[PDB]
Design a protein around this ligand. Structure first.
Ligand code: NA
Length: 245
């Protein structure tokens, strides 16, 4: 049982102009220092930064995606960007350098017309990677409400199972996944108030503070390589230490 019981004080990395965005780092290995950024909740470009100093100096190169993204729920893993293809129920896996895409359809997912998984961050899909798997958080188009998590096989970009948390998206601000546990924030994105053991398929007790700010939270992501939460909060890129008990 590695379960998170508290979150440390955040560190501010950088202030930027756009209210919504993502910032992403690799977690498959410890040799890649690149940082990727998307701005806004709709677009087709990604900014790539060589390392933290390049990020701090706004020194980026531009990557052109094969399809527009929606939302702020993307993830990077093993030199690939996973993102929601805007206007569809399709997830794109875009491999860097070779700059070519693969796709996965989630047939029973909400995906347009503001039927968001996380309304606060205009997000329909949240891809997450941790110590226990590659995951896609989404909301059911069948009941219109339930948060589901697809567990993927990374090597084949295919779905192994669809897990029903039974938790209604209207109660969720945002979420992240660590050591195989889904942690979901309240609607004001100040506390984690729900958790779900994805491997055992059951709710588990969790309630702990995340932050005091109530500025808009655009992105919230756990990185297993450094065991920090990464966030984008109204243009502030932040890092939070995590404490496991
Ligand atoms: Na998230």
């Amino acid at each position: 049982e590695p379960m998170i019981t508290s979150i440390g004080n955040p560190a501010q990395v950088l202030k930027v102009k756009e209210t919504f965005g993502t910032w992403l780092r690799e977690s498959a290995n410890r040799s890649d220092d690149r940082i990727w950024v998307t701005e806004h909740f709709s677009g087709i470009m990604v900014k790539e930064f060589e390392d933290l100093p390049a990020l701090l100096n706004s020194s980026f190169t531009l990557l052109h995606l094969p399809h527009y993204f929606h939302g702020c729920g993307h993830a990077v893993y093993n030199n690939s960007l996973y993102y929601h293809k805007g206007g569809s129920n399709t997830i794109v896996r875009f491999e860097f350098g070779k700059e070519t895409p693969q796709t996965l359809k989630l047939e029973d997912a909400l995906y347009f017309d503001r039927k968001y998984l996380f309304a606060n961050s205009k997000t329909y899909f949240n891809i997450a990677v941790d110590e226990k798997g590659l995951w896609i958080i989404y909301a059911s188009s069948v009941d219109g409400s339930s948060i589901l998590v697809a567990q993927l096989d990374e090597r084949t970009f295919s779905v192994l199972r669809h897990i029903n948390t039974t938790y209604p998206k209207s109660k969720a601000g945002n979420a992240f996944i660590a050591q195989g546990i889904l942690y979901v924030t309240d609607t004001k994105d100040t506390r984690v108030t729900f958790a779900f053991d994805l491997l055992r398929g059951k709710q588990i007790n969790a309630n702990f503070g995340l932050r005091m700010s109530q500025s808009v939270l655009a992105m919230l992501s756990y990185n297993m390589r450094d065991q920090h939460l990464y966030s984008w909060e109204d243009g502030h890129l932040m890092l939070y230490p995590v404490h496991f008990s």
